[PDB]
Design a protein around this ligand. Sequence first.
Ligand SMILES: CC(C)(COP(=O)(O)OP(=O)(O)OC[C@H]1O[C@@H](n2cnc3c(N)ncnc32)[C@H](O)[C@@H]1OP(=O)(O)O)[C@@H](O)C(=O)NCCC(=O)NCCS
Ligand SMILES: CC(C)(COP(=O)(O)OP(=O)(O)OC[C@H]1O[C@@H](n2cnc3c(N)ncnc32)[C@H](O)[C@@H]1OP(=O)(O)O)[C@@H](O)C(=O)NCCC(=O)NCCS
Ligand SMILES: CC(C)(COP(=O)(O)OP(=O)(O)OC[C@H]1O[C@@H](n2cnc3c(N)ncnc32)[C@H](O)[C@@H]1OP(=O)(O)O)[C@@H](O)C(=O)NCCC(=O)NCCS
Ligand SMILES: CC(C)(COP(=O)(O)OP(=O)(O)OC[C@H]1O[C@@H](n2cnc3c(N)ncnc32)[C@H](O)[C@@H]1OP(=O)(O)O)[C@@H](O)C(=O)NCCC(=O)NCCS
Lengths: 390, 388, 390, 390
Amino acid sequence: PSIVIASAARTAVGSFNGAFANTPAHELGATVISAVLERAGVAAGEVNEVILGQVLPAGEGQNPARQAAMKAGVPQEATAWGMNQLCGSGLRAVALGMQQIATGDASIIVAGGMESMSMAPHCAHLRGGVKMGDFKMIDTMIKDGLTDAFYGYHMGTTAENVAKQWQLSRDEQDAFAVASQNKAEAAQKDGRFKDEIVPFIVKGRKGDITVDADEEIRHGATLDSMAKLRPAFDKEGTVTAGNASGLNDGAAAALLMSEAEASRRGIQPLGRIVSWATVGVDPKVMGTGPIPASRKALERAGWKIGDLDLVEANEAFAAQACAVNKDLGWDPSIVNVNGGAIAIGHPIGASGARILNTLLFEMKRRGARKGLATLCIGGGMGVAMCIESL
Amino acid sequence: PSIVIASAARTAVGSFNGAFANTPAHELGATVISAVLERAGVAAGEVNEVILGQVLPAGEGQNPARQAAMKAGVPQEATAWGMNQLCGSGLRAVALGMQQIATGDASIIVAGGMESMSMAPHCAHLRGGVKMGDFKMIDTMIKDGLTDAFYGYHMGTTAENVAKQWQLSRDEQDAFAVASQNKAEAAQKDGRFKDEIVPFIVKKGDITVDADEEIRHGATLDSMAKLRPAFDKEGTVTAGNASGLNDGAAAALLMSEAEASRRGIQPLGRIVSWATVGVDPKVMGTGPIPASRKALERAGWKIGDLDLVEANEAFAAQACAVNKDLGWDPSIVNVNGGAIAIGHPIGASGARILNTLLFEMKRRGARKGLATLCIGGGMGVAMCIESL
Amino acid sequence: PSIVIASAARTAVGSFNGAFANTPAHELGATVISAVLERAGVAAGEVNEVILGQVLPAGEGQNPARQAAMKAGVPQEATAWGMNQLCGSGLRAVALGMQQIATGDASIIVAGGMESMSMAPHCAHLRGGVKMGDFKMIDTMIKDGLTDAFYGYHMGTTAENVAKQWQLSRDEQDAFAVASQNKAEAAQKDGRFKDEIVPFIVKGRKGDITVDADEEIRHGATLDSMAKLRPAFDKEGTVTAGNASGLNDGAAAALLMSEAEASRRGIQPLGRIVSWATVGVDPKVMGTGPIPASRKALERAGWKIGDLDLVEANEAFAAQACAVNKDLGWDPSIVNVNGGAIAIGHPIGASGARILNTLLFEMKRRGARKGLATLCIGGGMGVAMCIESL
Amino acid sequence: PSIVIASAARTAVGSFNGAFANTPAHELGATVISAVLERAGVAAGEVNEVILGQVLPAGEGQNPARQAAMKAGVPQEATAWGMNQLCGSGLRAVALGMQQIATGDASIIVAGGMESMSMAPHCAHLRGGVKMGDFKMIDTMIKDGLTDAFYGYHMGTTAENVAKQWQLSRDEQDAFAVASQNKAEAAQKDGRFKDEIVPFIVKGRKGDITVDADEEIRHGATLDSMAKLRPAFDKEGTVTAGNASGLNDGAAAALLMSEAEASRRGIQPLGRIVSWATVGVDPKVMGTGPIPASRKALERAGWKIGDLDLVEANEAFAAQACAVNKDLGWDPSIVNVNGGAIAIGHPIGASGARILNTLLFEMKRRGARKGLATLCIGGGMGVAMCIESL
Ligand SMILES: CC(C)(COP(=O)(O)OP(=O)(O)OC[C@H]1O[C@@H](n2cnc3c(N)ncnc32)[C@H](O)[C@@H]1OP(=O)(O)O)[C@@H](O)C(=O)NCCC(=O)NCCS
Ligand SMILES: CC(C)(COP(=O)(O)OP(=O)(O)OC[C@H]1O[C@@H](n2cnc3c(N)ncnc32)[C@H](O)[C@@H]1OP(=O)(O)O)[C@@H](O)C(=O)NCCC(=O)NCCS
Ligand SMILES: CC(C)(COP(=O)(O)OP(=O)(O)OC[C@H]1O[C@@H](n2cnc3c(N)ncnc32)[C@H](O)[C@@H]1OP(=O)(O)O)[C@@H](O)C(=O)NCCC(=O)NCCS
Ligand SMILES: CC(C)(COP(=O)(O)OP(=O)(O)OC[C@H]1O[C@@H](n2cnc3c(N)ncnc32)[C@H](O)[C@@H]1OP(=O)(O)O)[C@@H](O)C(=O)NCCC(=O)NCCS
């Protein structure tokens, strides 16, 4: 039983403490869940289950995926649950939502991701009591999403490990980030992000403001200031504040159904899910995650690396993104033709489905047959999925 | 060709701030992952992916399921991820792990759950800054796991809604709790929990915990009726007729039936069907009602075909309502007690009662089983197990 | 046996989270102590003891008055201690420092106050441990300085008690506040605050910023905003954000010595301490605090109410200041001739010595013989001190 | 003008997280204020001012000394204020309260101290906001009372400096602590603490518990276990957990009035205040504080070191207490005859008046003519007072 993606949508990737500074993740997800159903003509009462990945749900209440579904009109008879595979959470939900229909336990699935790093609180265990001495108020964003629990250093330090073994110079990493910014400004001005972005109305006390543009994109990004930034994680390192992904808020999802179910409704699906794969690697080089994951996904689909017509590779770091391209050897001209996470933004829970939206809508805009989306997961993991157009 | 559970294990359900007061959830899961692999002869290097549900991972670091796997010997080549469907997380992970092998994306899966409510921290958003006035330190246990986000009241209040429409008196609810307590002490003294419980070494000297500490030995009824109501001053649910706050973990080994025959393993049970259905968030306790009816429908079984049933006892009112609704024989429901006496680790109760379900079916020679739980927010999960 | 004030100084009263947002209280006191000694030619090695009042020292370390003395050059041979009588702390230290020389236990005393509400932290008791339930992180500024411990409501509510029985309308209180606002900036534009204010150097990473003007003073203070403000503490109250004192940071002190000691050093003192008094009242009507305190101070000095040439009355609230003026019957034209704490600012621990600086430097500028400074203290108390010219 | 102490009282010195774990400081002070007034026959309506020292008032509300007076029956007509001179606060209030009557501004003064380290909260500045990164919740007890703000280390580290320069071996400090322990248990069993200790009723929902015994005193303290304790502040140091004072809660005060007023009331006073002194030293060697302070106190009174019949010297640390004994040369058999703070306990805000209660009641118990109480103050200071019997 095949399984096609009938429609997809996503919110604009906001900056850290920016447009979505006080917007909970489920409010951004409910807007997406309401958007994918309109773009396919499917009603909310037909959704069997909503599957939204999220890495930082602290303070959001019971089951944030349930709140995003109930507010979006999904009836109480349906179910909802969350997931945490770090940066591959948004894309794995599409794979998990695909398995719900593959086994015959569901027919219509809204799968994607959501994240709100601006709403990430500070936590500390105080049940036993602090009899004497100062204690730490732990930032859940840095701890539960940006700090490797096995070695203790930041996700930028494991990128320094990728910056050493592959021998990627500072100037080469700066040229990859600035190129990603220019590819983002060109696609945004040409309206290539309008199809994927659904407007979100940020209700405020001083008036509602509709946000529909990726705020992280720097207009007129130069290179003389890219080399003037100090390294953030190592005094003698290469990763800085510009060549790495930032902290962002946003959401993204898609509508999942069988191919025979879409043909009955007369729906033209965005793409066909042919295969998927997830492989783990050394936690010191988590950025190499997409390397075995993409090779396993293509092997399951029966495709050669040269068979791909379009590729979306999440740009968590400049060193990590260059290393994956230099190993797989795929044509960089078809990789992130509209930019990547360095310019658009990196919502951990939503980046998996965010770049999948960019992957789907760009394939039909250009008429591409075969695609491949993949991301690197912290702790030494990687996820990948292949999409073929209808 | 199906999908069987080769082995299963769980830690002793500790009390809130008790034996596992300072033990992280992934430390309890690694012991379970090491136990399910030991009881089936499967090595850690053969696990493709571990799927462990957890509701309160705040402060535990990146992917607690990944930490529990690396310490248990699972190699870095395997993958790991967490999931949150509240109370049905432990049982849904088995269903999710079942789907990994059904589509052919994996061969060996360690699926279960874990929870550590004692390690649940207090949180507060402080990025924007508090210029003036005091602010609230939010308990992640109460907020993210025990408070309905749609109506605002506690999960004990949703039991009052079930206590009214079915008209279940406090004395009947008190008789259900005391009966569950007495049925728990019988199994603990008789060593019927020893097979499922794997000892955990809590590192002034190491203390090995291997017995469910929440079980009250000699629970009476004169004190059950003297307790004040906990969630409503004119309510019926108290501290004895409702589930408590507990820490623990539980998991199982998932593999194909044709894969078990190659290893010469005698599996605990075969996963025949599963289902998850949502209900009115005002009556979340009714969750197992449509979930159990759909699970039997997919497998093709009548309610009377079941030989053993494990129904999580989140509250006395919700557990009594499901029994009066499904009409199954109560003598085969929670034969060794329930969550009122053993304990209710939210993320692990789904796989906890599955361990009690699996080990009791083979101990007695039962053919067909059914485990189910009630999920907050108006949801319910259920799974059916057939013996080999 | 007399005791004269040889010199005095104070820093510019900064706004809440304004210029002194990150300046500790002892840094503001050290600048004053270095200023109190330099303007009189007295060296630091001659100071017997420094007495600085402070209400919110949480998080500043052991004895902030000791830190303010060591940084100002006072040698280790001297002693230091803090004091807390709420709002009358700055003026009480001068009375306490006067008693050190009166009994013969000291010769040179640097007495004053300091406050830094911007650095006031949030606190919560967590030694016993919070096993279950949410708990509150209490602001030390509101709790230990702005909340009456006997009845629980804010200091704005106890001003409402003066606003009800005394029957002071909002429009009359707004006319009293606007008059105080206009009188404060006039002294700033005419440079009437330059002599008493010592410049403070706010050390910054992007360059040092010298602060020498009271920023809390509203430039061009009109009445169009005074009548449009909603009540702050009670939906049916009269005190708002304009007619009440604000939250401020600052410090102030003075040099205390015997009259025969100033003549030996050839110092012309600012004023002679003639008497002082502190009397308690009903905590519900703390604004009446200065009423019995001033009557006892004049009685100890032997002066009638009509003998006063200049009066400084701290403006904690518009309602409390109006009630004191009509009961004592003194001429309002000599009361707060250069404005008050509503416009200049109200550092609780320092306002006692702040208005004393305005009292001291203005008496000879105008040729006043006798003065009287007073403040209202929360919890039903009042402080007063009388000053005679040399 | 003389000034006698008509009566005095104190609560039992509780252990850290012990009997007074959740008892606020003002509740402990109110019991003392009500006891000192009853033991002298003076009514509450005659109290002119209450002077209570406290070092950690964070979280207790506006003026904890005012709360302890209002609950103890002191009428609103009286005033109250706090002070912070660290460990010498309790004894300095008696000296400051003495100066109130010496200058003629008061007649009856209730002076003393109080402390409740168990109720000391954790604080953190959060007005500016924590955009990213973890932050510290600072323990006010360790920071504002147990950490020198000039060098950063604990008060045990400056005791290590006293343990080095004077060349005090570990065995000598251990022999001093065990001797103080034995002298404390003997006085408690012989009922020598019953007169000074007033019972405190800890009201609780599960029943009231009357506390009337110093809980910190270890019954049967040997030296074989004193040498088995690890050093607390330096891995190669001498100060441990047994030879140093602990963390404690409690209160203490006294009644101050003129000598001619006590004869009219038929009151037999405990002693006559002849002199007092406070001198500062190097904060690195605060333990030498009592050395010049006690020599200056005797110098003002006109007494030789050999004229003293009884001496109370606060035992904050074994090294500092031995150093004072080795310099002054007084007979150690008359110094802390009933033990010290090493065994009884060290409430910072109350230890100044705590040892004064032990000093006063012991002079009449044995018939001693002249006494002397002194303490070492953090930050390089020391306080001392001389007591003559009537
Ligand atoms: C790197 C990180 C710490 C950035 O926070 P930061 O250190 O404060 O740096 P900022 O992004 O806030 O910007 C800081 C400065 O860099 C400059 N800058 C940033 N990006 C730039 C760019 N792309 N081009 C030019 N200048 C840039 C800004 O103008 C700013 O200048 P300023 O200091 O005068 O204000 C944060 O984004 C991070 O942790 N990333 C980790 C990525 C990650 O973990 N991914 C996980 C996937 S596995
Ligand atoms: C609130 C809650 C945590 C109980 O905490 P609690 O109110 O402090 O009650 P406790 O369990 O700590 O025990 C309190 C008292 O009950 C008494 N008690 C407890 N269990 C008893 C029993 N089984 N029989 C008789 N008496 C009992 C104890 O002696 C104790 O007396 P004490 O207060 O004098 O010490 C519990 O009601 C709860 O919320 N459980 C979670 C339910 C839930 O949300 N489940 C979700 C699944 S959908
Ligand atoms: C009155 C008080 C409560 C105000 O706190 P606040 O309102 O939360 O702080 P704000 O700055 O936001 O209020 C100021 C607002 O009014 C406006 N405003 C206030 N006074 C004004 C004036 N005099 N003229 C013109 N505009 C004015 C400001 O522009 C600002 O704009 P906003 O309405 O959009 O917020 C504060 O001054 C206070 O704490 N008073 C009590 C002090 C005290 O108790 N002292 C001890 C007593 S002895
Ligand atoms: C040592 C200190 C830093 C903290 O240590 P601590 O956490 O209190 O030590 P603990 O209470 O946890 O227990 C210490 C051990 O020593 C033992 N011990 C302590 N004092 C003892 C004594 N006087 N005699 C015999 N045994 C003793 C205790 O029984 C305990 O045994 P344990 O190991 O089984 O716990 C603290 O006590 C201290 O010295 N604070 C300084 C106070 C201060 O400086 N005030 C200002 C004065 S200038």
